[PDB]
Amino acid sequence: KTEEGKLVIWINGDKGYNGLAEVGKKFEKDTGIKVTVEHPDKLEEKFPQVAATGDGPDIIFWAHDRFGGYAQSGLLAEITPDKAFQDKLYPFTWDAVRYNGKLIAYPIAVEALSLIYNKDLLPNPPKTWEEIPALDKELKAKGKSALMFNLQEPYFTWPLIAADGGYAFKYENGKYDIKDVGVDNAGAKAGLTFLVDLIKNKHMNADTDYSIAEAAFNKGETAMTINGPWAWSNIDTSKVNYGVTVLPTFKGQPSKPFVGVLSAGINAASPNKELAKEFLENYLLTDEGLEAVNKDKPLGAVALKSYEEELAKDPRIAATMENAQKGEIMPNIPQMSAFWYAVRTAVINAASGRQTVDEALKDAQTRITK
Numbered sequence: 001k002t003e004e005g006k007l008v009i010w011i012n013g014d015k016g017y018n019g020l021a022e023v024g025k026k027f028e029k030d031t032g033i034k035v036t037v038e039h040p041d042k043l044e045e046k047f048p049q050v051a052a053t054g055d056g057p058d059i060i061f062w063a064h065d066r067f068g069g070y071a072q073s074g075l076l077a078e079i080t081p082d083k084a085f086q087d088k089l090y091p092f093t094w095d096a097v098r099y100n101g102k103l104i105a106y107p108i109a110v111e112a113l114s115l116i117y118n119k120d121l122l123p124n125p126p127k128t129w130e131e132i133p134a135l136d137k138e139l140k141a142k143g144k145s146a147l148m149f150n151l152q153e154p155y156f157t158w159p160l161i162a163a164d165g166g167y168a169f170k171y172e173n174g175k176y177d178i179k180d181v182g183v184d185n186a187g188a189k190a191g192l193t194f195l196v197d198l199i200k201n202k203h204m205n206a207d208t209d210y211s212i213a214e215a216a217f218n219k220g221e222t223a224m225t226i227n228g229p230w231a232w233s234n235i236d237t238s239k240v241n242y243g244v245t246v247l248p249t250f251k252g253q254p255s256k257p258f259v260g261v262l263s264a265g266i267n268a269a270s271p272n273k274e275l276a277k278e279f280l281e282n283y284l285l286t287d288e289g290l291e292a293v294n295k296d297k298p299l300g301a302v303a304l305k306s307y308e309e310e311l312a313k314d315p316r317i318a319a320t321m322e323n324a325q326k327g328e329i330m331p332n333i334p335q336m337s338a339f340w341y342a343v344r345t346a347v348i349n350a351a352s353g354r355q356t357v358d359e360a361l362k363d364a365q366t367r368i369t370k
Contacts, residue, residue: 002274007035008058011264012043013109019292023283033279048075051267059276061264064097067105068332075268076104090305092325096261100174104265106284108293109301111230111260112320112327113156117243122223127249136202139223148222151208154343155258156231159327161191162256168328168339176331181365183339184346184358190251196350206351229300229320230260244315247323257327262301338368 007024017037024035040046047060048070060067070076081101086094097107117124125131125146135146150156162168164187169176199206208216217225217238225238226247247255266276283289290307300316302308311317330336342364349357 002272003032004057004272004275005032005034006057007033007275007279008055009035009037009061009264010040010043010047010059011037011061012039012041013061013262013297014039016293016296019289019296023289023292024279027279027283044070048268051075055267056271057275059264059266059271061108062262064105064107064261064263065330067097067263067265068330069334070268071104071265072332076265077267077270078102078104079266088305090308092321093261093302093305093308096259096324096329097263105263106265106280106304107261107263108303109229109260109262110317110320110324111228111258111262111300112323113159113226113228113230113247113255113257114316114319114323115226115245115247116224116238117245118223118239119241119243120239121220122239124224124243129248129250132198132202135223139221140202144221144223145202146222147224148216149213149225149227150210150231151206151213152344152347153210153231154340156226156255157195157347158343159255159257160195160250161188162328163187163250163253164190165253166191167256169331178333178335178369181369183343184362184365187251187253189358192347192350194251199351226255228257228323229316230258233298233300244319246319254326257323259324259327259329261329335368338364342368 005028007027009020020035020037024033027033027035043060044062044066047055047058050058052075066074067076071078078099079102086098086103093107093110094103096110097103097105125135129147132146139145162183164185166183166185166188168181168183169178170180170182172180214236216222218236220238247257266273280289284304285306287307287310290303291310293303294301294307294311297303299314300320302311302317302321308317308321342361346357346361346364349355349360
């Protein structure tokens with residue numbers, strides 16, 4: 001047999017020392033556990049680098065996107081096939097970090113987006129953004145707008161442009177692969193087109209940055225935004241009284257949200273599965289593990305179906321999962337850089353009138369895929 005008396009856990013959430021340390025203590029008091037939790041910046045690069053020299057006892061917790069990649073070439077130990085293990089979780093939060101009858105980790109955070117309504121000093125529309133011209137027109141009359149938010153990001157802005165019908169990659173049983181890229185479709189155009197309409201007459205310019213746009217809502221002269229447990233985890237002074245709703249409609253379709261799985265997997269190759277497999281299985285599946293973290297946790301996030309229910313208590317998660325599953329999960333290849341650069345260029349290509357967006361970006365597909 002192989003028994004030890006140490007437990008290392010890597011997490012980049014900034015918390016969970018009381019519960020993680022308190023639990024392992026319990027394992028120690030019975031006969032063999034000492035758990036440590038580190039929260040560095042290179043955690044991801046460090047982990048695979050340390051993993052390779054001589055780390056051993058020590059797990060890693062971070063988004064699935066790079067864990068996907070690292071999983072392929074980086075340093076994740078693609079767990080083996082089980083029955084009740086995968087059969088005991090739910091289809092959405094576990095499907096985010098799931099491969100063709102495979103999976104290299106457990107998720108613990110759902111990134112998504114919901115509609116928030118301003119009450120006290122902000123009257124919102126019933127179902128269409130189309131009201132902006134009208135409702136914003138009224139705001140203009142004084143000095144404000146109905147809706148304020150970012151001004152150049154994918155994930156969220158991407159989702160809208162996705163409304164009509166431009167998906168990222170083509171997911172087909174196997175994988176998007178590469179030769180099927182349908183982002184730059186009539187819907188991406190049509191979608192960004194309606195966006196261009198907004199900026200075309202009211203917004204006019206489009207240099208409001210994340211930090212600057214942040215300042216805009218900071219003063220609070222807008223009566224509506226679309227956000228969720230992903231871009232704004234630590235909500236700012238945005239009127240205590242606010243509603244929490246599902247995203248709105250657009251050209252007969254819902255915006256495509258980017259899917260986020262914050263998950264801690266067991267190494268690349270196989271790190272003492274006996275100790276980690278039992279505790280994780282016997283504690284994480286307890287209100288002590290799952291809920292001790294949760295308390296440490298902030299608000300939006302995840303950690304196993306049962307705890308999904310307890311955690312679900314908050315209106316955030318329910319919406320967070322609803323969108324997380326009905327959207328696009330970041331691929332699993334290094335080519336993603338080709339798009340971010342192409343779409344950001346193309347986007348800027350459409351906003352200044354010097355264009356060649358369809359082509360620059362379309363051809364981009366040709367390049368990124370060929």
